[PDB]
Amino acid sequence: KSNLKPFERDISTEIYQAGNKPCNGVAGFNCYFPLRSYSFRPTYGVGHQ
Amino acid sequence: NCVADYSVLYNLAPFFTFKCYGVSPTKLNDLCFTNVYADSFVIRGDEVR
């Protein structure tokens, strides 16, 4: 939602709403899942290791 | 030499596949970047990924 204070920990995975119309768990239009990830295959450069 | 107000450009899309990299999808209005290019075509459904 916004910026967090120094030395803080947050674990909330609630759906994030930007363009109104909350999805309420649908994770579809006008809503994005807060949590993301990426692969860790060894064939990556120094910019992704 | 104009403003691209994407607030209506993403529109009432039934499904907008706005998988974007290098910037958060909402923080482009405040950006004042350089020229943009437009081009489009049509692809069979399966291999959109």
mmCIF file of C-alpha atoms in Angstrom:
data_model
loop_
_atom_site.group_PDB
_atom_site.id
_atom_site.type_symbol
_atom_site.label_atom_id
_atom_site.label_comp_id
_atom_site.label_asym_id
_atom_site.label_seq_id
_atom_site.Cartn_x
_atom_site.Cartn_y
_atom_site.Cartn_z
ATOM 1 C CA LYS A 1 0.000 0.000 0.000
ATOM 2 C CA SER A 2 2.759 2.467 0.922
ATOM 3 C CA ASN A 3 6.318 2.740 2.233
ATOM 4 C CA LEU A 4 7.287 1.098 5.520
ATOM 5 C CA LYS A 5 9.323 2.441 8.417
ATOM 6 C CA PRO A 6 12.961 1.435 9.015
ATOM 7 C CA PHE A 7 13.568 -1.844 10.861
ATOM 8 C CA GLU A 8 10.089 -3.246 10.247
ATOM 9 C CA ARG A 9 8.704 -6.656 9.289
ATOM 10 C CA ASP A 10 5.388 -7.252 7.515
ATOM 11 C CA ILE A 11 4.004 -10.615 6.404
ATOM 12 C CA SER A 12 0.546 -9.651 5.144
ATOM 13 C CA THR A 13 -0.447 -11.318 1.863
ATOM 14 C CA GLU A 14 -3.757 -9.477 1.427
ATOM 15 C CA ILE A 15 -4.823 -8.689 -2.131
ATOM 16 C CA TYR A 16 -3.654 -5.238 -3.230
ATOM 17 C CA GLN A 17 -6.164 -2.904 -4.894
ATOM 18 C CA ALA A 18 -5.117 -0.024 -7.155
ATOM 19 C CA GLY A 19 -7.946 0.733 -9.590
ATOM 20 C CA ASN A 20 -10.817 0.082 -7.162
ATOM 21 C CA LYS A 21 -13.247 -2.859 -7.518
ATOM 22 C CA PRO A 22 -11.587 -5.212 -5.000
ATOM 23 C CA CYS A 23 -11.313 -8.799 -6.196
ATOM 24 C CA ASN A 24 -11.690 -10.330 -2.699
ATOM 25 C CA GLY A 25 -9.483 -13.312 -3.490
ATOM 26 C CA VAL A 26 -10.236 -13.483 -7.223
ATOM 27 C CA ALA A 27 -6.784 -12.028 -8.042
ATOM 28 C CA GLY A 28 -8.030 -10.846 -11.426
ATOM 29 C CA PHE A 29 -8.902 -7.458 -12.901
ATOM 30 C CA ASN A 30 -7.784 -4.274 -11.107
ATOM 31 C CA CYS A 31 -5.982 -6.336 -8.456
ATOM 32 C CA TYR A 32 -2.519 -7.882 -8.152
ATOM 33 C CA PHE A 33 -1.128 -10.504 -5.798
ATOM 34 C CA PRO A 34 1.367 -8.835 -3.418
ATOM 35 C CA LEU A 35 3.739 -11.822 -3.393
ATOM 36 C CA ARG A 36 5.997 -12.689 -6.339
ATOM 37 C CA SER A 37 8.980 -14.937 -7.018
ATOM 38 C CA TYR A 38 11.451 -15.969 -9.705
ATOM 39 C CA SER A 39 13.503 -18.973 -10.760
ATOM 40 C CA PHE A 40 17.010 -19.742 -9.487
ATOM 41 C CA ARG A 41 18.475 -21.862 -12.274
ATOM 42 C CA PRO A 42 22.302 -21.900 -12.334
ATOM 43 C CA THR A 43 22.451 -20.589 -15.917
ATOM 44 C CA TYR A 44 21.948 -16.982 -14.785
ATOM 45 C CA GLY A 45 24.313 -14.033 -14.932
ATOM 46 C CA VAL A 46 25.764 -11.998 -12.092
ATOM 47 C CA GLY A 47 22.766 -9.670 -12.386
ATOM 48 C CA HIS A 48 20.393 -12.462 -11.343
ATOM 49 C CA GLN A 49 22.479 -14.767 -9.133
ATOM 50 C CA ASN B 1 4.203 15.866 -27.567
ATOM 51 C CA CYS B 2 1.103 14.709 -25.687
ATOM 52 C CA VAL B 3 0.097 12.839 -22.524
ATOM 53 C CA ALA B 4 -0.805 9.143 -22.707
ATOM 54 C CA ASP B 5 -3.404 8.845 -19.935
ATOM 55 C CA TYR B 6 -3.409 5.075 -19.481
ATOM 56 C CA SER B 7 -6.071 5.348 -16.754
ATOM 57 C CA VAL B 8 -8.570 5.004 -19.608
ATOM 58 C CA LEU B 9 -6.170 3.214 -21.986
ATOM 59 C CA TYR B 10 -6.096 -0.044 -20.025
ATOM 60 C CA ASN B 11 -9.839 0.526 -20.260
ATOM 61 C CA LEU B 12 -12.621 -1.911 -19.312
ATOM 62 C CA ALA B 13 -10.576 -4.723 -20.796
ATOM 63 C CA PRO B 14 -12.126 -8.178 -20.203
ATOM 64 C CA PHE B 15 -8.590 -9.447 -19.540
ATOM 65 C CA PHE B 16 -5.618 -7.091 -19.875
ATOM 66 C CA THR B 17 -2.389 -9.128 -19.866
ATOM 67 C CA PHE B 18 -0.309 -6.268 -18.501
ATOM 68 C CA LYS B 19 2.710 -8.383 -17.531
ATOM 69 C CA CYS B 20 5.224 -5.563 -17.237
ATOM 70 C CA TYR B 21 8.895 -5.379 -16.305
ATOM 71 C CA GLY B 22 11.166 -2.565 -15.176
ATOM 72 C CA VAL B 23 8.381 -0.463 -13.624
ATOM 73 C CA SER B 24 5.307 -0.933 -11.475
ATOM 74 C CA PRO B 25 2.195 -0.882 -13.709
ATOM 75 C CA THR B 26 0.621 2.011 -11.778
ATOM 76 C CA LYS B 27 3.615 4.382 -11.547
ATOM 77 C CA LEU B 28 3.870 5.661 -15.107
ATOM 78 C CA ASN B 29 1.767 8.844 -14.962
ATOM 79 C CA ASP B 30 4.402 10.636 -12.880
ATOM 80 C CA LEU B 31 7.149 9.369 -15.194
ATOM 81 C CA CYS B 32 8.327 11.826 -17.852
ATOM 82 C CA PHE B 33 10.261 9.424 -20.069
ATOM 83 C CA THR B 34 11.166 9.744 -23.750
ATOM 84 C CA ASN B 35 9.367 8.836 -26.976
ATOM 85 C CA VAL B 36 7.222 5.713 -27.313
ATOM 86 C CA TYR B 37 6.581 3.330 -30.202
ATOM 87 C CA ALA B 38 3.324 1.621 -31.164
ATOM 88 C CA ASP B 39 2.870 -1.635 -33.092
ATOM 89 C CA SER B 40 0.467 -4.552 -32.894
ATOM 90 C CA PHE B 41 -0.596 -7.804 -34.540
ATOM 91 C CA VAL B 42 -2.703 -10.894 -33.812
ATOM 92 C CA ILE B 43 -1.452 -14.245 -32.509
ATOM 93 C CA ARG B 44 -3.163 -17.589 -31.994
ATOM 94 C CA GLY B 45 -4.440 -18.035 -28.472
ATOM 95 C CA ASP B 46 -2.178 -20.704 -27.002
ATOM 96 C CA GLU B 47 1.244 -19.175 -27.703
ATOM 97 C CA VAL B 48 0.526 -15.722 -26.259
ATOM 98 C CA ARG B 49 2.941 -16.869 -23.547
#
